[PDB]
Design a protein around this ligand. Structure first.
Ligand SMILES: [Cl-]
Length: 149
């Protein structure tokens, strides 16, 4: 309804006025409720140099339910699966209307930097992250080269 549209426009404007570091987001075309986003691989992470795309769909009662957010770029990470689904509590049980796309993008950036142990969406990647970090990094770098450049 009009409440969601007002908030979504305000958030688009918030991102333009204070352009993050290393992320962007906004409507695909003219559909305010369907956005794209991009996140640059953080420096000093195995994703450095990559560019990762995401899709975002706002519900019609945003901001009082969460947006649906998924990666569209393949990534080697314990909490993001091959469907691009993202295990992040803010997008589920922990949503609040005080969260915004900017905060969500910052949280996903931090998640790339430091995975969540409790949430292995891809159990084998979570295992290599815990047991052999240098191997995890090497493979995450290789997938950044293959998919995100
Ligand atoms: Cl508002």
């Amino acid at each position: 309804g009009a409440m969601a549209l007002k908030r979504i426009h305000k958030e688009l404007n918030d991102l333009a006025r204070d352009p993050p570091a290393q992320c962007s987001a906004g409507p695909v075309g003219d559909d305010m409720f369907h956005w794209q986003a991009t996140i640059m691989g953080p420096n000093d992470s195995p994703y450095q140099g990559g560019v990762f795309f995401l899709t975002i769909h706002f519900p019609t009662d945003y901001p009082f339910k969460p947006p649906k957010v998924a990666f569209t770029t393949r990534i080697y990470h314990p909490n993001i699966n091959s469907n691009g689904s993202i295990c992040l509590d803010a997008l589920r049980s922990q949503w609040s209307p005080a969260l915004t796309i900017s905060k969500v993008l910052l949280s996903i950036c931090s998640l790339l930097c430091d995975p969540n142990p409790d949430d292995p969406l891809v159990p084998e990647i979570a295992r290599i992250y815990k047991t052999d970090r240098e191997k995890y990094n090497r493979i995450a770098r290789e997938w950044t080269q293959k998919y995100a450049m």
